[PDB]
Design an enzyme around this catalytic site. Structure first.
Site, PDB file in Angstrom:
ATOM      1  N   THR A   1    -119.142 -29.796 -27.310  1.00  0.00           N
ATOM      2  CA  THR A   1    -117.824 -29.911 -26.227  1.00  0.00           C
ATOM      3  C   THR A   1    -116.683 -28.860 -26.706  1.00  0.00           C
ATOM      4  O   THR A   1    -115.752 -28.752 -26.086  1.00  0.00           O
ATOM      5  CB  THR A   1    -117.112 -31.315 -26.914  1.00  0.00           C
TER       6      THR A   1
ATOM      7  N   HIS B   1    -116.474 -33.967 -38.108  1.00  0.00           N
ATOM      8  CA  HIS B   1    -115.152 -33.403 -37.479  1.00  0.00           C
ATOM      9  C   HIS B   1    -114.618 -34.447 -36.737  1.00  0.00           C
ATOM     10  O   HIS B   1    -115.442 -35.298 -36.277  1.00  0.00           O
ATOM     11  CB  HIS B   1    -115.107 -32.119 -36.892  1.00  0.00           C
TER      12      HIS B   1
ATOM     13  N   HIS C   1    -109.935 -24.848 -34.889  1.00  0.00           N
ATOM     14  CA  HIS C   1    -109.956 -25.717 -33.766  1.00  0.00           C
ATOM     15  C   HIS C   1    -110.131 -27.179 -34.093  1.00  0.00           C
ATOM     16  O   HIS C   1    -109.698 -27.977 -33.404  1.00  0.00           O
ATOM     17  CB  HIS C   1    -110.954 -25.581 -32.666  1.00  0.00           C
TER      18      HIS C   1
ATOM     19  N   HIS D   1    -111.702 -35.113 -33.337  1.00  0.00           N
ATOM     20  CA  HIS D   1    -110.836 -34.748 -32.178  1.00  0.00           C
ATOM     21  C   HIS D   1    -109.672 -35.522 -31.969  1.00  0.00           C
ATOM     22  O   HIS D   1    -109.942 -36.752 -32.265  1.00  0.00           O
ATOM     23  CB  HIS D   1    -111.564 -34.381 -30.879  1.00  0.00           C
TER      24      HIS D   1
ATOM     25  N   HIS E   1    -116.979 -37.052 -34.811  1.00  0.00           N
ATOM     26  CA  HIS E   1    -118.304 -36.501 -34.438  1.00  0.00           C
ATOM     27  C   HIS E   1    -119.036 -36.140 -35.819  1.00  0.00           C
ATOM     28  O   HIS E   1    -118.633 -35.217 -36.495  1.00  0.00           O
ATOM     29  CB  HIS E   1    -118.223 -35.162 -33.568  1.00  0.00           C
TER      30      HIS E   1
ATOM     31  N   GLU F   1    -112.352 -37.586 -26.696  1.00  0.00           N
ATOM     32  CA  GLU F   1    -113.177 -36.781 -25.824  1.00  0.00           C
ATOM     33  C   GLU F   1    -113.962 -37.588 -24.853  1.00  0.00           C
ATOM     34  O   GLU F   1    -113.893 -37.443 -23.677  1.00  0.00           O
ATOM     35  CB  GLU F   1    -114.073 -35.550 -26.446  1.00  0.00           C
TER      36      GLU F   1
HETATM   37  N1  LIG Z   1    -117.613 -31.267 -30.723  1.00  0.00           N
HETATM   38  S1  LIG Z   1    -119.274 -31.012 -30.926  1.00  0.00           S
HETATM   39  O1  LIG Z   1    -119.524 -32.110 -31.801  1.00  0.00           O
HETATM   40  O2  LIG Z   1    -119.851 -30.927 -29.648  1.00  0.00           O
HETATM   41  C1  LIG Z   1    -119.751 -29.796 -31.722  1.00  0.00           C
HETATM   42  C2  LIG Z   1    -120.662 -29.730 -32.730  1.00  0.00           C
HETATM   43  C3  LIG Z   1    -120.983 -28.293 -33.005  1.00  0.00           C
HETATM   44  C4  LIG Z   1    -120.691 -27.045 -32.502  1.00  0.00           C
HETATM   45  C5  LIG Z   1    -121.318 -25.768 -32.812  1.00  0.00           C
HETATM   46  C6  LIG Z   1    -120.498 -24.641 -32.524  1.00  0.00           C
HETATM   47  C7  LIG Z   1    -121.109 -23.507 -32.602  1.00  0.00           C
HETATM   48  C8  LIG Z   1    -120.899 -22.100 -32.522  1.00  0.00           C
HETATM   49  C9  LIG Z   1    -122.107 -21.215 -33.071  1.00  0.00           C
HETATM   50  C10 LIG Z   1    -123.281 -21.478 -33.382  1.00  0.00           C
HETATM   51  C11 LIG Z   1    -123.704 -23.171 -33.349  1.00  0.00           C
HETATM   52  C12 LIG Z   1    -122.397 -24.078 -33.189  1.00  0.00           C
HETATM   53  N2  LIG Z   1    -122.400 -25.428 -33.044  1.00  0.00           N
HETATM   54  C13 LIG Z   1    -119.714 -27.241 -31.121  1.00  0.00           C
HETATM   55  C14 LIG Z   1    -119.393 -28.518 -30.899  1.00  0.00           C
HETATM   56 ZN   LIG Z   2    -116.727 -32.667 -31.862  1.00  0.00          ZN
END
Ligand SMILES: NS(=O)(=O)c1ccc(-c2cc3ccccc3[nH]2)cc1
Ligand SMILES: [Zn+2]
Length: 258
Positions: free
Chosen positions: A196, A92, A62, A94, A117, A104
Site C-alpha cells: 500500500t 506497522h 512514513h 496506518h 499490518h 486503509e
Molecule cells: N503497508 S504494507 O503492509 O502493504 C507494506 C509492506 C511492505 C512494504 C515494502 C516497502 C518496500 C520497499 C523496498 C523493498 C521492499 C519493500 N516492502 C510496503 C508496504
Molecule cells: Zn501497511
C-alpha cells in the site's frame, strides 16, 4: 520531492513515479461484506508467534516499524489461503488525524481509526527482497483498530514512541510479543493485492481480520505525536499515513466465515 501523504506528494501523485499504482491488483480495497463469498475450502489461519524475536522499532518517515529476526522460522503465518510458510519481518500501522479515519481497507465503506499490518514473506523465495518480486511473495495480516478500551498489549509500543519521534530514529525493542495485538477471532477476508506504499508491488496475499481490536483514545493520540520530518526540521505530524481504497478490478474477496 519524494512520495508521502501531503497535498503535493500524496497517493494521487504516486503513479508518476510508480506507474503500477494504476495496476490490476492494487491495495487497499473496500471490502463489500455482502459481495465477499464464503469459501468453505479456506483453512483456519495458523499464527505461530510464540518464538518471535522483536529487535528494534524504527520511524521510517512514513510509519514506525517493529522489526523481527526473520533469519529463521520463529514467528510464522501459515494456512488460510497460503501455500507454504511466511515469516514475520515487521509490523506497522496506518492511522488518521481523527478517530473517523486512518484505516486503509474499509468495510462497507466504514473507515476505522487505524490499521495494523503484520508483514510476512514466503520462505520459498529465500529473503524479503526476492519475495516482493513474486506474486505470492508476501502475506500481510491486517487488523483494524477502533477507539474504545485500551489494548494492554499495545502500551509497550506507545510508550517507546517519544524516543523515535522523527524520521530515521530507531530504538531497541526486544521481547515484544505481537500475540498481544490480536483479536479473539481469526475470521478473515482474503484477496490478492499489493503493497500500500511505494513501490506498490503486486506481491501480497492480503488477509484482513473481521474483528477489530480496541485501543484507547490516549493510545492513538500518542501515534499522532510522531513526526514525518527528520530531527531539526519543521514539525509535520505523522497522521493520515493511509492510502485510500483502490479499484477492485477483476478480483473476488473471499471470506473464511459464514
Ligand atoms: N503497508 S504494507 O503492509 O502493504 C507494506 C509492506 C511492505 C512494504 C515494502 C516497502 C518496500 C520497499 C523496498 C523493498 C521492499 C519493500 N516492502 C510496503 C508496504
Ligand atoms: Zn501497511
Amino acid at each position: 520531492h519524494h512520495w508521502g501523504y501531503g497535498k503535493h506528494n500524496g497517493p494521487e501523485h504516486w503513479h508518476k513515479d510508480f506507474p503500477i499504482a494504476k495496476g490490476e491488483r492494487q491495495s487497499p480495497v473496500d471490502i463489500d461484506t455482502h459481495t465477499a463469498k464464503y469459501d468453505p475450502s479456506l483453512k483456519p489461519l495458523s499464527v505461530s508467534y510464540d518464538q518471535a524475536t522483536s529487535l528494534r522499532i524504527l520511524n521510517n518517515g512514513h510509519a514506525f516499524n517493529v522489526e523481527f529476526d526473520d533469519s529463521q522460522d520463529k514467528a510464522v503465518l501459515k494456512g488460510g489461503p497460503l501455500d507454504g510458510t511466511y515469516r514475520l519481518i515487521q509490523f506497522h500501522f496506518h492511522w488518521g488525524s481523527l478517530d473517523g479515519q486512518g484505516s486503509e481497507h474499509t468495510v462497507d465503506k466504514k473507515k476505522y481509526a487505524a490499521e495494523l499490518h503484520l508483514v510476512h514473506w514466503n520462505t520459498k523465495y529465500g529473503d524479503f527482497g526476492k519475495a516482493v518480486q513474486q506474486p505470492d511473495g508476501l502475506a500481510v495480516l491486517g487488523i483494524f483498530l477502533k477507539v474504545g478500551s485500551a489494548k494492554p498489549g499495545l502500551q509497550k509500543v506507545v510508550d517507546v514512541l517519544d524516543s523515535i519521534k522523527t524520521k530515521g530514529k530507531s530504538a531497541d525493542f526486544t521481547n515484544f510479543d505481537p500475540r498481544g495485538l490480536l483479536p479473539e477471532s481469526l475470521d478473515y477476508w482474503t484477496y490478492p493485492g499489493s503493497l500500500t506504499t511505494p513501490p506498490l508491488l503486486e506481491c501480497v496475499t492480503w488477509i484482513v481480520l473481521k474483528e477489530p481490536i480496541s485501543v484507547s483514545s490516549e493510545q492513538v493520540l500518542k501515534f499522532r505525536k510522531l513526526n514525518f520530518n527528520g530531527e531539526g526540521e519543521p514539525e509535520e505530524l505523522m497522521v493520515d499515513n493511509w492510502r485510500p481504497a483502490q479499484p477492485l478490478k477483476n478480483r473476488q474477496i473471499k471470506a473464511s466465515f459464514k
